Symmetry: D5
Subunit: 138 residues, 10 copies
């Protein structure tokens, strides 16, 4: 939020910042919002890109206590939740059939989000498949 305010002053888009720094747009956005962290060298570079002093680079490096903002009621966010309420079992079935018994990780995961021709929201999620342990003794 000290970082967001600084970004608005400069007239920078999240897209622009990501391209200047050569990093994933959604991840970088999450670092600035404090749901993720970076190494110190990127932190210094973020500070320069924005107006701010290198004394704030520390905050971007601290691991955060994540996933704890109550935002469930925001209509934009609810829709993503509704989407997995409706298609969840289908995604479960498809993933089981095509990858096997496992899950898609939320940790090793690259989100991308894009406006395409026709102005539709295109959200691409790219996650590691982790198979479940199968009881092997060595």
């Amino acid at each position: 939020n000290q970082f967001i305010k600084a970004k608005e002053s400069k007239g920078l888009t999240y897209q622009q910042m990501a391209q200047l720094l050569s990093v994933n747009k959604v991840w970088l956005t999450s670092v600035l919002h404090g749901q993720n962290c970076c190494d110190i060298q990127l932190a210094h570079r973020i500070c320069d890109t924005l107006g701010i002093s290198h004394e704030y680079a520390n905050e971007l490096t601290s691991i955060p206590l994540r996933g704890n903002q109550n935002i469930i009621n925001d209509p934009l966010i609810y829709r993503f939740n509704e989407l997995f309420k409706v298609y969840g079992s289908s995604l479960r079935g498809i993933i089981h059939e095509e990858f096997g018994d496992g899950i898609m990780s939320a940790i090793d995961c690259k989100i991308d989000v894009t406006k395409n021709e026709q102005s539709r929201v295109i959200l691409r999620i790219d996650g590691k498949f982790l198979p479940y342990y199968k009881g092997q003794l060595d």
Copy 2:
């Protein structure tokens, strides 16, 4: 589930069924799971593809109660929920900046899911942006 049992007997994948019927794989899967419905002509073709009788086609046509299966605890599903707990505010901010004040619809929405080389799960969601009424 009468439809899923029928599908397993034949050794059909969801992919295969979708390509035979020329429809979105995820949507079709959701019709078979009863979270979505189709018109009668597709319903007959589904039945036609599966072992089953055309007397079943009615069930695929009924608008079904939606979003009411308590699957929150399944680890696979939880992860998608966790993902929006973590990146939700970021997505919100990006969408606001790049589209304006609105939302991405869950109704007019095309999911796609894919194994890419390197065996990563690739989930693509394609939704209509609806702007808020402005006075």
Copy 3:
């Protein structure tokens, strides 16, 4: 609430403000309550209409977080919720039969509210019908 306090001072009704500004009464009311936002030019005009300085116009422009005021227990609001607990399935059935498989949007939506003869509360809701995706490839 700085806006509401200002409105009460002047003896303005929500009706009056809406007619002066040529906007939907309910929507404008929601802007003042911080559940919706406007463009900067309307924001300046709202400020002039009320007592207040144009330095507050910024707050009316910021997109807020929406739907997160814990007002469920207020009897006036509960009633609306009870109303859809009782008639919900009926509205669902009628809409399905007369529009098809879809929903009525809460986003593209015009509320209107009126005292009619006999002093009855007349609430009119005017929403876009969005049909569900039907699996078309092209």
Copy 4:
């Protein structure tokens, strides 16, 4: 649901049934769904309109337990909820200013729902305003 199945067989719309019986469409629909009840004479008439035997008229007459079907997650219904989450305080303020300190009843209430030109869903709710007791002895 034994009533809904009967209606579908005949190819009747909720609109048609309401116009034949000279009653509010939404209310009637709610009687058939078991969220409301009618008198015995209307119940018999509903039974004739549909295929069914009068022996079922009793179910339409019993006052049920209301508002207890867990339909919150249906996207269509959620939207109406979200709508009052967003505009609730505004409606509260407007009603207070234009009627006074009270509420709009959900009991004495006429819903109406309509497809208008352009295919927009037009829901009209018509409720009694009840003012709060003001402490008069």
Copy 5:
């Protein structure tokens, strides 16, 4: 709400006494002072008059309050009233249906009264309008 209460305790006034001085229902008045109900400006000035306080506070008593939102469920005194309707609720429902018809007893148009009788029993009298459900007429 406490500010009024504090003023009442100073003067050694009972809720009973205040109600009789002002010619209003005791329970309703008490609820105005607790901020779960409001009065008109003339009664507000008189309340301020009865208590120590300045007329400048009369405004707070006139604002429609955001009701029913004090988390008092765990107080044993309050829990019992809730338990009471858990146990006798269906019976009251059945009796009211048989003797009044298909409707409800309003919580809006409602006069509570509460009294110590001989034998020291708590006597709570609730007097509410019966509202019948809409019967589909035109």
Copy 6:
């Protein structure tokens, strides 16, 4: 419910049954609904009053698991709950001032419910006041 069905057959009101048996109307109603129980001699008399066989009197004598019917959403019952959300703190304050530090029991409690001259629902609750233990020894 075997008891309620039997009552409807005979065309008996809860009022009538209570007057025939010389017992509180609301309490009796609760016995028939299985939220309360009676002694065997009353149980036999209830059976005689209704069509039914005496053999069945035992069900009326069993102590039942109370307050566990999920009726919270019924509009008629909700209103009673909303009523104590709004006036709860007021009733707590009045009872404290007029009886002292204690509660009104839900166990030793006589409900009465009545249609008055004005066709208003009149609900009278008559409960024992129990004061809190004050630390005295033996």
Copy 7:
């Protein structure tokens, strides 16, 4: 908590305070924690027993808004809750058989808590049995 701090300074145990004042240990403790209240004469005496001024005696006299401290997650307390989850129905059945259809009051109730030989926690609860109303008509009709 001003009272607790004062008690810790003096090195007083809840046992000691109770014996000096001739009152139930657990009840007194609950007064000091603000889940119960006393009369003014005991309040003055509590104040003297602790370091504190008689001026604070008022707070001990106010009726409190009880039972509203969110302590459910404390392991010590959770155990008591688990205990009634496991034995609740049994206690219900025994009380019904030996007293009748009623309850044991939490209002007219004397708790006592003790370390006995063998260092076991011994918790004794002594409550009034209240029978349910049995439908008797009042004097009127």
Copy 8:
């Protein structure tokens, strides 16, 4: 419940059964209710005391899935819960002072319940004190 039905037939009290078998009354009651289990020798003896066949003895030996009967709303049970809501912090403080930093076990625990001379419910709970681990390397 097959065990309870058998007990009611014989006219046995929980007290009597306990005395005959030389076991804690509350614990035995819990075995019959399926919140606890016994060894096979006691199980056979329970079966003989009641009318029933020894084949039913195994059910008493199975470790049950405990603490999962939704009895929170029963007024008799709620009161015990309320009691620890009100006196919980006091008990916490007393135990800390007189035993140290630990807890009273619900596992190694002897309940006893008794009607005294004054017809008061006397509930005695006798539990092992377990001190928290203090970080010792040995």
Copy 9:
């Protein structure tokens, strides 16, 4: 539960079954409980080990909707939950310091449970550390 009943008949311990089949004791136990699944060849072998027919091997192969048995109130289970309520933030801190910003997987995870020389319950959990995404592109 048809599998558990079969096991109790034969007087087999979970330990014994695991050693006969050369698999992790806790995982196998979870297959029999229906919180995990195995391949068909192990499924047949499980059936042989127990009394039962190879027609039941199918149930052991189905992927199950996991983590949905309401066992939170069982005292034994509660204890494990309480343990992470108390030490959770400490484990979080230690793992951050010693492995970095990530998590320990519950998917690639080997539980082991043992009675030691001192008759103490020794639970050993062995999980993969997954670090969070770096933002690479």
Copy 10:
């Protein structure tokens, strides 16, 4: 958190602090996080090891109200929960078979957590088994 900030300044690891003070690493970490407490002599030593003044030693000595930090949504912590959702019944069964009818204590319990050679998280929990009371009168 005043303790954690102090630890980060000095560049101390939890491992180092534990080795220096001769205590269990996880337990000490919990003391710093306020989910456990120590005696005054260790508290003083902790203060020296960190930058801080001996006036803060008191906080480390207070018995804390445990298990009440709302950290359920942190992905790292959720996983431990999910783990017992999946394997809970299995652990229950194994422990019943190999120890008997009881539980593993969370009170008398030594956690240990370790990076092994292959960089896997190895969490070792060492708890007392407490058997349930078996109804004995001796």
